Amino acid sequence: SPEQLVLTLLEAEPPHVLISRPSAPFTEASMMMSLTKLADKELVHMISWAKKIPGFVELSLFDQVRLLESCWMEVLMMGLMWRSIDHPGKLIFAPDLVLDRDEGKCVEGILEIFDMLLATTSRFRELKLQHKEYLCVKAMILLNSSMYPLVTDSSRKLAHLLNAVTDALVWVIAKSGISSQQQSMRLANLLMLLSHVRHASNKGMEHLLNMKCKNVVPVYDLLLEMLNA
Amino acid sequence: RHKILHRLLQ
Numbered sequence: 552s553p554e555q556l557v558l559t560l561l562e563a564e565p566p567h568v569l570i571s572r573p574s575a576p577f578t579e580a581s582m583m584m585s586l587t588k589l590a591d592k593e594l595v596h597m598i599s600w601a602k603k604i605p606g607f608v609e610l611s612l613f614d615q616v617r618l619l620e621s622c623w624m625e626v627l628m629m630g631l632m633w634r635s636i637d638h639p640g641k642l643i644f645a646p647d648l649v650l651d652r653d654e655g656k657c658v659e660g661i662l663e664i665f666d667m668l669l670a671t672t673s674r675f676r677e678l679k680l681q682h683k684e685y686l687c688v689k690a691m692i693l694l695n696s697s698m699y700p701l702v703t704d705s706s707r708k709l710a711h712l713l714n715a716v717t718d719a720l721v722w723v724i725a726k727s728g729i730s731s732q733q734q735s736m737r738l739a740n741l742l743m744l745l746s747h748v749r750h751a752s753n754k755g756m757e758h759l760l761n762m763k764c765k766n767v768v769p770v771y772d773l774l775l776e777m778l779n780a
Numbered sequence: 781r782h783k784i785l786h787r788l789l790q
């Protein structure tokens with residue numbers, strides 16, 4: 552139910568992972584080490600986060616797994632964008648890892664991804680995305696992935712959940728008291744940005760997979776696993 | 781395959 556759902560999401564927010572720039576100037580290797588070390592740690596916390604969304608731990612194991620494998624990059628990126636929303640031309644990876652757009656030149660293939668992330672962030676900035684809208688959108692990202700039938704009521708349980716999240720978002724948007732038509736436009740504007748987030752995610756995944764192959768960066772543990780597919 | 785994920789979910 553919308554108010555309670557929204558408070559649960561609020562209380563579910565994962566902590567800020569702290570990381571710092573290395574002492575030496577960035578290289579491709581050292582930049583990738585920093586961002587993957589950050590991602591890996593944030594992944595740990597994303598599991599605990601997901602488990603706090605009502606219903607999530609009532610879905611089947613394969614379902615929880617499949618949603619998390621499918622959305623984790625998207626969720627990393629969404630959280631990044633929210634962190635960076637007030638800081639044009641910058642990506643706020645962590646309080647002490649604030650990358651200027653140009654610093655992406657450091658890593659082959661990454662500037663384009665920074666620009667996508669930056670563009671999607673500006674679009675949220677233009678729309679004046681509100682904290683509670685961000686909470687709902689991020690949970691929708693967890694819940695809204697293709698789930699063609701696997702061969703292993705969880706699917707209806709999924710729909711009910713994503714339904715309640717979508718209602719919560721509609722309810723948050725109602726608080727603005729704007730025109731009915733403009734409440735529809737805003738919903739559409741926020742959900743249409745979900746594709747952009749999926750799209751960046753796709754480029755991010757591919758970029759990192761390739762970095763891993765070229766042994767340009769070692770990846771460990773959770774991140775390594777989520778990567779191995 | 782989800783050696784660690786399963787671990788953390790359960």
Ligand SMILES: C[C@]12CC[C@@H]3c4ccc(O)cc4CC[C@H]3[C@@H]1CC[C@@H]2O
Pocket residue numbers: 586587589590593627628630631644661664754755756758759760762
């Ligand atoms: C996945 C990459 C490393 C981890 C990066 C990260 C790391 C942490 C985070 O909160 C967000 C992102 C989004 C951009 C990601 C990068 C885009 C491609 C690069 O390989």
